[PDB]
Design a binder for this molecule. Sequence first.
Ligand SMILES: CN(C)C(=O)c1cccc2c1-c1ccccc1C2=O
Length: 289
Amino acid sequence: GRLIYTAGGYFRQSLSYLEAYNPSNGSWLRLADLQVPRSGLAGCVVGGLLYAVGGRNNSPDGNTDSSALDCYNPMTNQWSPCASMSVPRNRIGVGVIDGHIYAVGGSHGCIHHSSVERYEPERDEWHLVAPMLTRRIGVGVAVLNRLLYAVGGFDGTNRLNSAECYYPERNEWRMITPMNTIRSGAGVCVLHNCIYAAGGYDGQDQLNSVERYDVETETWTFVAPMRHHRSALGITVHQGKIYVLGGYDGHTFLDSVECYDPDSDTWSEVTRMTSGRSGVGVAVTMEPC
Ligand SMILES: CN(C)C(=O)c1cccc2c1-c1ccccc1C2=O
């Protein structure tokens, strides 16, 4: 029994919610709040533990960018602090390779990071690796065939259609084919042999378009668009289908969750979050307790 966990997010202020959705029965489960509210974080799972990485606490009494790594154990329904990153990273992207967590990009105040660092759970240590060729915040990140991809974002001046790939054994980043669309704050994930980029902000509008990169052919192709335009959406894959959660459509903070079936190239509404929000962290692991 595997669940889609959504951590944090933003509506009026940064949120502390941890809620888990069960696609087998449509149920939502409210779980232990984050110790610190945060939006613009990323979520990921290593060894059945859920991790919340980076973000920012937008609060009535201040805005604090987060370098925090916090671990959630579903067996205990408890959050524990882990080692903090070298720098705060708001609107971060993360990916997991070989049990290690890679933190990519993000902002610290007006600083837009190209820097990248790697967490080793068995030592509770972060270490910096080679930086990206481009500064990227609102960057989408995914892992395919043990290579790490950084897609889109904002470099401080322009929103980006560019993307690049990290080769761990060479500690080296290389540009890949750019997307067909400029996207900041897109949902980026992997399904089969393709990197998907859904939604985001192109500098003028929130997008509903979706495109995917075939690593073998090195081309981006559009698929069916989402039913809702959305930036700052959460995304994950669960049993061969993409789920997108919430985001901002220029008018509302969405509670809509949509599901993409790649066999039929269609999106359907599958549930609503308990409240509209953007900038969530999302990951999949076992059900709690
Ligand atoms: C920058 N960008 C990726 C946006 O989508 C965006 C653009 C203009 C205004 C806003 C946003 C945005 C994104 C998420 C939460 C709130 C906002 C806003 O007020």
